[PDB]
Amino acid sequence: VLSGTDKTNVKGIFSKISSHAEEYGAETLERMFITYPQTKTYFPHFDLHHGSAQIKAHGKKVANALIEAVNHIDDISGALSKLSDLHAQKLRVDPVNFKLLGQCFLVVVAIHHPSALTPEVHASLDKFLCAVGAVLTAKYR
Amino acid sequence: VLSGTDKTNVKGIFSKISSHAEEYGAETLERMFITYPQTKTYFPHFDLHHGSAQIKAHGKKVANALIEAVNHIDDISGALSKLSDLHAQKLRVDPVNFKLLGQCFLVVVAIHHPSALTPEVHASLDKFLCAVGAVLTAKYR
Amino acid sequence: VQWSAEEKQLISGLWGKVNVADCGAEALARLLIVYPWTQRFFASFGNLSSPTAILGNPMVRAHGKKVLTSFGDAVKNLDNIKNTFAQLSELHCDKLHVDPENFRLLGDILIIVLAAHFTKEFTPECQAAWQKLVRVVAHALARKYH
Amino acid sequence: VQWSAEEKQLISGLWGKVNVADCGAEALARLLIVYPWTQRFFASFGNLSSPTAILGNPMVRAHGKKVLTSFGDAVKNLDNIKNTFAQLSELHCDKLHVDPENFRLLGDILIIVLAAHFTKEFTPECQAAWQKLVRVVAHALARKYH
Numbered sequence: 001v002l003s004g005t006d007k008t009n010v011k012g013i014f015s016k017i018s019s020h021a022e023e024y025g026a027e028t029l030e031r032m033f034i035t036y037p038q039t040k041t042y043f044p045h046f047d048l049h050h051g052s053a054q055i056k057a058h059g060k061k062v063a064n065a066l067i068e069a070v071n072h073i074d075d076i077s078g079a080l081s082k083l084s085d086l087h088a089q090k091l092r093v094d095p096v097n098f099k100l101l102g103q104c105f106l107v108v109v110a111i112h113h114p115s116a117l118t119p120e121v122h123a124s125l126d127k128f129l130c131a132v133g134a135v136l137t138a139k140y141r
Numbered sequence: 142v143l144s145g146t147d148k149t150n151v152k153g154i155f156s157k158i159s160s161h162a163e164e165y166g167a168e169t170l171e172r173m174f175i176t177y178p179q180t181k182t183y184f185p186h187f188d189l190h191h192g193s194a195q196i197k198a199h200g201k202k203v204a205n206a207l208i209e210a211v212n213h214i215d216d217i218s219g220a221l222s223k224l225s226d227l228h229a230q231k232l233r234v235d236p237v238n239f240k241l242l243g244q245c246f247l248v249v250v251a252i253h254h255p256s257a258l259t260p261e262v263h264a265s266l267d268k269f270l271c272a273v274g275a276v277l278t279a280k281y282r
Numbered sequence: 283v284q285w286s287a288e289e290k291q292l293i294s295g296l297w298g299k300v301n302v303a304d305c306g307a308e309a310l311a312r313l314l315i316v317y318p319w320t321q322r323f324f325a326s327f328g329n330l331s332s333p334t335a336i337l338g339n340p341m342v343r344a345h346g347k348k349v350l351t352s353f354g355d356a357v358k359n360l361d362n363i364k365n366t367f368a369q370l371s372e373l374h375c376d377k378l379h380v381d382p383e384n385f386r387l388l389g390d391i392l393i394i395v396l397a398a399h400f401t402k403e404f405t406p407e408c409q410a411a412w413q414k415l416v417r418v419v420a421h422a423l424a425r426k427y428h
Numbered sequence: 429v430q431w432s433a434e435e436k437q438l439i440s441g442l443w444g445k446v447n448v449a450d451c452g453a454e455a456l457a458r459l460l461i462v463y464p465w466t467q468r469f470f471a472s473f474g475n476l477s478s479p480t481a482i483l484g485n486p487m488v489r490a491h492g493k494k495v496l497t498s499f500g501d502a503v504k505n506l507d508n509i510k511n512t513f514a515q516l517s518e519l520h521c522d523k524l525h526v527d528p529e530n531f532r533l534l535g536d537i538l539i540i541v542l543a544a545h546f547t548k549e550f551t552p553e554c555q556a557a558w559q560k561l562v563r564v565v566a567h568a569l570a571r572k573y574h
C-alpha cells in the first residue's frame with residue numbers, strides 16, 4: 001500500500017500542480033494519443049487533433065479525479081469507485097492502457113516539475129497511480 | 142473483489158482439493174520448473190529433480206498457504222501478510238512469476254477435476270490466485 | 283526457436299487427439315468470461331452479457347473453432363510459424379489493435395483447456411512443449427507491432 | 429521497423445544533448461527504487477538498502493552510464509538494432525534470465541528521466557519517437573527468448 005511518507009509525497013507534488021489540472025490532464029492525454037495511438041480507439045467520438053476542445057474538457061475531468069483521489073488518499077476506492085463501472089463494465093478499457101496514461105502523467109510532471117520528481121517522489125507517485133488504476137479496473141476482479 | 146459466488150466457487154473447489162493438497166502443491170511447482178525453467182533461479186539450494194524431498198515439502202507448504210487463504214477468504218491480506226515480507230522483501234521475487242505459478246496450479250486443478258473447473262469456477266479461481274499474488278507482492282506497491 | 287524431437291512428438295501426438303470445435307469454442311468462451319475486456323473486440327458477435335450467453339453464442343463457438351484450426355496451422359508447419367501468421371499479425375495488430383498481452387492470456391486459457399481435456403496425459407513435459415508453441419504463436423502474431 | 433525522417437531527426441537531435449553519465453546513473457537508480465525486485469539482479473553491486481544508498485552507489489552509477497551508452501548505439505544505428513543487441517540479448521536472456529517485462533520498465537524510466545532533463549523540449553512528438561526507440565530496443569533485447 002501507500003505509506004504515510006507516500007501520501008505525504010503525493011500531496012506535496014499535487015500542491016505543486018495545483019492550479020494546473022486542466023492543462024496537465026490535457027497534456028497527459030495528448031501525449032498518450034501520439035505516443036500510444038492505439039488508445040485513440042476509445043474516443044471515436046472526440047476530435048482528436050491537438051488542443052481540441054473535447055480533449056481539454058476531458059483532461060480537466062481526468063485531473064480533477066486524480067486531485068479528488070489525492071484528497072481522499074486514505075480510501076481511494078471510496079472516492080473513485082463510480083469510475084470502475086464506466087471504465088471496466090461500460091467501456092471495457094484494456095487494463096494495459098492504465099499504465100500508458102500513468103506513464104504520460106509522470107512525464108507531464110517531470111517536464112513541469114523536474115526537481116520535485118525525485119526518485120522517492122517518483123516511486124510514491126507510481127504507487128499512487130497504480131492504486132488509482134486498480135480502483136478503475138476493479139470490476140475486472 | 143471476490144463476490145460471494147466467487148468465494149463459494151473457490152471454497153467449493155478447494156473442498157475437492159483438500160485431501161490432495163500436498164501432492165498438488167508439488168505438482169504445481171514441478172510444472173512451473175519444467176514449463177518456466179527461469180523460476181528455478183529462486184531455488185538454488187533445492188534439489189530440483191522431480192519428486193525430490195525439498196520440492197515435495199515446499200509444495201505442501203505452498204498448498205497449505207493457499208488453503209489458509211481460502212479459509213480466510215474474507216480477508217486474504219490479513220492471513221498472508223507474513224508471506225509478502227518473505228516474497229517481496231527478502232526474496233525479491235519478480236512479479237511476473239506469480240502468474241506462472243498460478244497458471245500451473247490451474248493446470249493441476251484442471252487435470253484432476255476437469256468437470257469441476259467450469260468456465261465460472263475458472264473465473265473465480267483466477268480472481269483468487271490474483272488476489273493472493275497481489276498480497277504477496279504488496280511490499281512493492 | 284529450435285524444436286526438439288521430443289517436443290515435436292508431444293505436439294503432434296496430442297494435436298491428433300484435440301477436438302478442434304469443442305476445445306476451440308471453450309478457450310474462446312473462457313477468454314471472454316475470465317478476461318471480460320476482450321469482449322470489446324467481439325461486438326459483432328451479439329450477446330456476451332453473461333457466461334451462459336457466451337457459452338451459448340454460436341458466433342463465439344464458430345470463431346473459437348477457427349482460432350484453434352489456426353493453432354493447428356502452426357502444429358502442421360512448426361518451423362514456418364512466423365510466415366503462417368503474417369496476415370493474421372496485420373489483422374490483429376494493424377486492423378484490430380489487440381494488445382499482445384491478450385495473445386498471451388488466450389494461450390494460457392488454451393493450455394488450461396488442453397489440461398482439462400487430456401487430464402494426466404497432459405504431462406509436465408507436454409505442458410512445457412505446448413506452452414512453448416503458444417508462446418511462439420503469440421510472438422509471430424505480434425510481429426507487425428515490431 | 430520503419431523510421432521516418434522526423435523520428436530520426438528527433439532522436440539524433442535530443443541524443444546530442446543527453447548527459448549519458450548522469451541520465452544513465454539516474455535511470456538505473458530509479459529502476460531499483462521504483463521497482464525494488466530488480467535489485468535482485470544487482471546483488472554484486474553491494475548496498476542497495478535505501479534510495480539514498482542506491483543513488484550513492486558507485487557501481488549503480490557506473491553501470492548506468494554503460495546501459496545508456498548502449499542505448500546510444502541504437503540511436504547511432506537505427507536500422508541495424510536487432511544485430512547491435514544480439515550478444516546483449518543472450519546475456520540478458522540466457523545468462524541472466526531477465527524477464528523482458530523489465531526491459532519495458534527500464535525504457536519507461538528512461539523516458540521520464542529524459543523528460544526531466546529536457547523539460548518542454550521533450551514535446552509529444554519527441555516522447556513518441558523516444559518511446560518507439562526504447563520499445564525497439566526492448567524487443568531486440570528480448571529476441572533470444574524467441
Ligand code: HEM
Nearest residue numbers: 039042043058061062065066091093097098101132133136
Ligand atoms: C487511472 C487513470 C484514469 C483516470 C483518473 C480516469 C478518469 C476519468 C474520468 C474522471 C472520466 C469522466 C467520467 C464522467 O464524465 O462520468 C473518464 C471517462 C472516460 N475515460 Fe478515463 N481515466 C483513467 C484512465 C483511462 C484510460 C487508460 C482510458 C483508455 C485508454 C480511459 C478512457 C475513458 C473514456 C473513453 C471516457 C469517456 C469519456 C467521454 O466520452 O467523455 N480512461 N475517465
Ligand code: HEM
Nearest residue numbers: 180183184202203206207224232234238239242273274277
Ligand atoms: C501466490 C503463490 C505463492 C504462494 C501461496 C507461496 C507460498 C510460500 C510459502 C508458504 C513459503 C514457505 C515459507 C516458509 O518456508 O515457511 C514460500 C517460500 C518460498 N517461495 Fe513462495 N509462494 C508463492 C509464490 C512464489 C513464487 C511465484 C516464487 C518464485 C517463482 C516463490 C519462491 C519461493 C522461494 C524461493 C521460497 C523460499 C523457499 C525455501 O527456502 O524454503 N514463491 N512461499
Ligand code: HEM
Nearest residue numbers: 320323324326348349352353378380384385386388389420
Ligand atoms: C493468441 C492467438 C490467436 C490466434 C491464433 C488467433 C486466430 C485468429 C484467426 C484465425 C482469425 C480469423 C480472422 C477473421 O475471421 O476475421 C482471428 C480473428 C480475430 N481475432 Fe484472433 N487469434 C488469436 C488471438 C486473439 C485475441 C487475444 C484477440 C482479442 C482479445 C483476438 C481478436 C480477434 C478478433 C476480434 C477477430 C475477428 C473476428 C471477426 O469479426 O470475424 N484474436 N483470430
Ligand code: HEM
Nearest residue numbers: 466469470494495498499524526530531532534535566569
Ligand atoms: C532494456 C534496456 C537495457 C539495456 C540497453 C541494457 C544494456 C546492458 C549493457 C550494455 C550491459 C553491459 C554488460 C557488462 O558490462 O557486463 C548490461 C548488463 C547487465 N544488465 Fe542490462 N540492459 C537493459 C536492461 C536490463 C534490465 C531491465 C535488467 C534487470 C532489471 C538488467 C540487468 C543486467 C545485469 C544484472 C547486467 C550485468 C551487471 C554486471 O554483472 O556487471 N538489464 N545491460
